[PDB]
A and B are shown apart, each in its own frame.
Chain A
Amino acid sequence: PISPIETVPVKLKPGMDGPKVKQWPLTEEKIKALVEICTEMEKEGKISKIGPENPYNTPVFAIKKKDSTKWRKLVDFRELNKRTQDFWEVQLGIPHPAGLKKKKSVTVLDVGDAYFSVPLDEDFRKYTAFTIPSINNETPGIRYQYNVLPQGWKGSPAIFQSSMTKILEPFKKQNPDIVIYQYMDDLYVGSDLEIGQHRTKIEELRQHLLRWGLTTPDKKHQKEPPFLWMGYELHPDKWTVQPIVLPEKDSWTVNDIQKLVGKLNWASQIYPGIKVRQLSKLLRGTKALTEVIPLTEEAELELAENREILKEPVHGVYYDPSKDLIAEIQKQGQGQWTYQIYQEPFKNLKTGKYARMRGAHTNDVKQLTEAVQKITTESIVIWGKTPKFKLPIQKETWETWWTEYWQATWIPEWEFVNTPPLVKLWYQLEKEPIVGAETFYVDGAANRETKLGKAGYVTNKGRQKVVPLTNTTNQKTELQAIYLALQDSGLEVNIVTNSQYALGIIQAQPDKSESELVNQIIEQLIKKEKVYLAWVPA
């Protein structure tokens, strides 16, 4: 019955007390369901009948589980949770199907009644009390106290996992060849033993689990591929995600677009070159999760492209420790990047994408060295080793960035593939002042109160412009006098600003940014041949 596993000692944050929340009204359907589940769990010794303790009561409810016609009884334990001590969660992440080797013998086994099989500390069973309501109306209502782990408490996850470990441990010492993936109570058991011989150890693991009262039903015992594991359809040599159904609708509410972005983010780990930026910009602003957002033009063709990638079927492959890990990054435009991890051409381990904008003003070199750090950590997570990169940037284009940048920046062992479009810096700033160049001393300042600022420049040959502007700032006006030093000068110009803000935004070679002023400066720093900049505090 209830596992003979020892219990985990759980206390309440010093001073707090149990939940006296009432039992919110429930529909007769869920009333019947609750009474049936509760009657059987009573006979087994899962929930004990409660008498006159304190009046601890946490509400109960019930949802339909998976695709089954069975009901899952859950309990709103938000109140107990807030006053229960804190637990260090042990699950440090989810298992990915591409860190798994190809194995001739594999079984997927699931412990049934997983939480209601591990004991709960007796000196804490009180607080978990509940009041199954009445089928009629006000009949007293049988009230019980959970003896097993409740399906809604905060400590239940961590306690089950740490415990399932101490049950699988003696079996792991006996079988070093066996490979067990334990996610909560889902078990992936793989070895390169003979099928007839393998089965015999899947008949022995089951008995080891049963000795600790963990039944493994033979209805959810997947014995032959294609296995359904962690949302993936794992065939013996190839693995793929289970079918992904993108919603098809005419009107697109904010929540529908959020669902679409979520599905395409999930569908971007196997499908190549998935873009969501043109759709993810329809969620900036509107907060009404029901406003009917009309689909634009820059997003309709992007959604169509995403749908055409999801037309033909793709599949990954399994990790081969002998071979080498490669990552091929491609720039897709508008700050979007894609990457593919593989060991042989036209056979990918896992695909991906990077479209984050980490900063105010940044170029493609920094945005690529950020994607490199992402794939690097994802690989240390999945495979434990750094891959070798195939970045589309010239060796000297990165060498000049590495030696003319004040920050320490690295990319690990990488190599350059000549495929368009290559990442490049669109302009450069001279080291020494340019001989025979018009010099522009630019200065722009505003009045905090009146909000209008004057910005202008003084040159060495009479030219002297001053322009006023409104709704400005004592920094935004300064970064405008430079724009007036680029909009009148020829193909060669020397600029002497006075701001540490102006330089820093300019000295980092930006190529795109939110500020329409900075972007307009960048546009005219590109058509200029040899620009120079310097700062003098006078």
Chain B
Amino acid sequence: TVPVKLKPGMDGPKVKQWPLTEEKIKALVEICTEMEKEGKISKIGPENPYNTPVFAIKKKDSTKWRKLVDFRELNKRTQDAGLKKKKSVTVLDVGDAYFSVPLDEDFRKYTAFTIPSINNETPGIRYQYNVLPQGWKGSPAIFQSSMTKILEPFKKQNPDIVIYQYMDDLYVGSDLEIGQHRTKIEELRQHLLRWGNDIQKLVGKLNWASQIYPGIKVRQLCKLLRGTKALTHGVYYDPSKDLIAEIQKQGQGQWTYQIYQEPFKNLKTGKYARMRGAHTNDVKQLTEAVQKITTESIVIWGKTPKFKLPIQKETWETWWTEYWQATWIPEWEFVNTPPLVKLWY
């Protein structure tokens, strides 16, 4: 369990820290100062060359700021249909019991982060973890391997279905779509805090011929075109490849997403619409869409997709942290090219 190492060939994260707000910096300071006295993190110096970005989020409970570390390179560099119950399989979070298992001493130097300061009045204050953090891909494995002794007391005489997840939120699988809001969370209450043109457009849409489904003609469709007229299922996901997610903005706060493994072979397709509300806050809808697709890839497949967001880089980097309310931070590129061909999807 404890003995963990890095995928052979690379060194460790060296990501810089983006600026933050006082409402976030103060929360991070009050969280780090409190954690230091519990022996969860420890101050370090510049002699550690590693760095991962940090920030804080207000979870939906809206009672306290939770800390978040952009532990993405530390997962990309680390080596090592059961939920058909109901539909939107749902659960809370499991990240506060993670502190009961210490990090390996040889490993702690990689999980280093920096706390910035307003107006840059003081050089950044660096810390490194001492217990298993939240957001590292191995941490659920090291924790589960020894703590599965508690993944049975909640069962007792309860078959239920499957469960599991990826980062920290151990999702459940209760088929019961009733109950007192699933009041059966008694052992889950334990061992968590106490360790333990019409023709033109239509032929355009027929360019989606052999691309998606091989074997089409699209010739009698263009019989009334190309001249001089007045313009007046069965998907295959190999569990070694990465699911890819594509998002397109279609106006009026309507977004379309398609999860595909290979190009033009989509395993999932959907449309997320929020109409007005966020209204001008489009970045809040996209960010919500991202927390909508991702968990879906978790419930049915298991791994987060790589998102080709239709947003600009700077806008996303500036505003994505404010609306984020998820422990995972998926990976994403940015589509700098009109995915608006000719009224498709």
Contact = CB atoms under 8 A, between A and B. Distances in A.
Interface string A27-46: 00000000000000000000
A232 B55 CA distance: 32
B238 interface: no
Interface stretch (B70-78, B87-95, B155-163, B335-343): B335-343
A383 B46 contact: no
B110 to A, nearest CB: 12
B126 A459 contact: no
A9 B340 CA distance: 56
Contacts of A406: 248-249, 310, 338-340
A88 B48 contact: yes
A96 B114 CA distance: 21
Given A85-B47, A87-B46, A381-B120, A370 B282 contact: no
B50 interface: yes
Contact of A408 (B123, B226, B282): B282
B225 interface: yes
A494 B21 contact: no
Contact of A381 (B19, B282, B309, B337): B19
Contacts of A228: none
Given A382-B119, A408-B249, A435-B232, A162 B45 contact: yes
A406 B203 CA distance: 22
Interface in B49-84: 49-51
A300 interface: no
B222 interface: yes
Residue of B122, B225, B342 with most chain A CB atoms under a 10 A cut-off: B122
14 contacts: A9-B47, A88-B46, A88-B51, A95-B120, A159-B46, A181-B122, A373-B318, A377-B318, A402-B282, A408-B283, A500-B341, A534-B200, A536-B200, A537-B203
Interface of B: 14, 17, 19-23, 25, 45-51, 112, 114, 116-126, 197, 200, 203-204, 207, 222, 225-226, 228-232, 248-249, 251-252, 280-283, 285-286, 309-312, 314-315, 318-319, 337-342
Contacts of B282: 402, 408-410
Contact of A377 (B19, B117, B119, B281): B19
A94 interface: yes
A407 B46 contact: no
A494 B20 contact: no
A385 B23 CA distance: 9
B203 A538 contact: yes
Given A373-B314, A377-B19, A161 B204 contact: no
A8 B309 CA distance: 43
Contacts of B207: 537
A538 to B, nearest CB: 4
A535 B197 CA distance: 9
Interface of A: 8-10, 85-96, 99-100, 155, 158-159, 161-162, 165, 179-182, 369-370, 373, 376-377, 380-385, 402-411, 432-437, 439, 441, 458-460, 494, 496, 500, 503-504, 507-508, 532, 534-538
B203 A404 contact: no
Nearest to A94: B120
Contact of B123 (A182, A381, A402, A538): A182
Contacts of B337: 504
Given A95-B119, A381-B120, A537 B204 contact: yes
A99 B120 CA distance: 9
Contacts of B309: 408
Contacts of A433: 197, 231-232
B21 A385 contact: yes
B203 A410 contact: no
A89 B25 CA distance: 19
Contacts of B229: 439, 460
A388 to B, nearest CB: 14
A377 B321 CA distance: 13
Contact of A380 (B19, B45, B200): B19
A414 to B, nearest CB: 10
Contacts of A162: 45-46, 123
B200 A155 contact: no
B20 A384 contact: yes
Contacts of A380: 19-21, 318
B200 A88 contact: no
B126 A407 contact: no
B283 A410 contact: yes
Nearest to B228: A460
B231 to A, nearest CB: 4
B45 A410 contact: no
Contacts of A404: 251
B312 A90 contact: no
Nearest to B199: A536
A198 B58 CA distance: 40
A434 B48 contact: no
A159 B197 CA distance: 68
Given A88-B46, A91-B123, A165-B122, A439 B340 contact: no
A366 to B, nearest CB: 9
Given A95-B120, A460-B229, A407 B114 contact: no
Contact of A459 (B197, B228, B249, B252): B228
Which residue of B119, B311, B338 has the most chain A CB atoms within 10 A of its CB atom? Answer: B119
Contacts of B25: 384
Contacts of B125: 165
A107 to B, nearest CB: 15
A10 B126 contact: no
B46 A384 contact: no
B24 to A, nearest CB: 8
B17 A92 contact: yes
A538 B46 contact: no
Nearest to B340: A406
Contact of B315 (A165, A410, A434): A410
Nearest to A537: B207
Contacts of A436: 230, 232
A210 to B, nearest CB: 21
A155 B46 contact: yes
B33 to A, nearest CB: 12
Contacts of A155: 46-47
B310 A10 contact: no
A434 B207 CA distance: 24
B226 A538 contact: yes
A534 B48 CA distance: 57
A118 to B, nearest CB: 12
A94 B122 CA distance: 10
Given A88-B46, A384-B21, A409-B282, A437 B225 contact: no
A538 B126 contact: no
Contact of A383 (B119, B225, B228): B119
A85 B338 contact: no
B251 A403 contact: yes
Contacts of B21: 380, 384-385
B251 A496 contact: no
Nearest to A378: B19
Contact of B120 (A91, A373, A403, A410): A91
